[PDB]
Amino acid sequence: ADLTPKVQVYSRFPASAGTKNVLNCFAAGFHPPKISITLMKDGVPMEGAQYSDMSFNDDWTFQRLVHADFTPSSGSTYACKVEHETLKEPQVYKWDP
Questions:
Q1: Which stretch of DSSP H or E encloses residue 19?
Q2: End-to-end CA distance of the chain, in Å?
Q3: In three state form, how does the secondary structure of 31-91 look?
Q4: Cβ neighbours of residue 89 under 8 Å, at least 6 residues apart?
Q5: Smallest Cα–Cα separation from 69: which of 52, 48, 96?
Q6: Nearest one of 72, 64, 88, 91 to 80, comparing CA atoms
Q7: Can you tell me the distance from the alpha carbon of 78 to that of 67, in angstroms, rounded to the nearest whole number?
Q8: The domain 1-97: what is its CATH number?
Q9: Listed residue (60, 65, 67) closest to 32, CA to CA
Q10: Geometric angle at alpha carbon 68, from 22 and 39, rounded to 5°
């Protein structure tokens, strides 16, 4: 029944300005496996993103992870934008440092 992506956006380490880190966006619990997950900085997709293989779970749903090496800056805004068939409008999940 409930096949919308359940999404978490988070950094590997607690954020500090100027310090190398990794931004992650994790989507799980969705069907069909087709999904658009985009890490965003200042309203534009972040360069350097690397996507995991799609994986399925015993509850017959799929998951995927996107991550990108990044150095958070103050004054910048980060987010994960998710597009999926189950979502009427694409959803933007904000990350706060």
A1: none
A2: 34
A3: CCCCCEEEEEECCEECCCCEECCCEECCCCCEEEEEEEEECCCCCCCEEEEEECCCCCCCE
A4: none
A5: 48
A6: 91
A7: 13
A8: 2.60.40.10
A9: 60
A10: 110
Residue 85 in tokens: 């068939």
Tokens of residue 68, six digits: 């990108």
Q: What are the structural domain ranges in the chain?
A: 1-97
Buried b (16+ CB within 10 A) or exposed e, 87-96: eeeeeebebe
- How was this structure determined? It was done by X-ray
DSSP state of 13: S
Structure tokens at 51: 């996507």
The residue whose two tokens read 């069907």 is 31
Output the six-digit token pair for 18: 């100027």
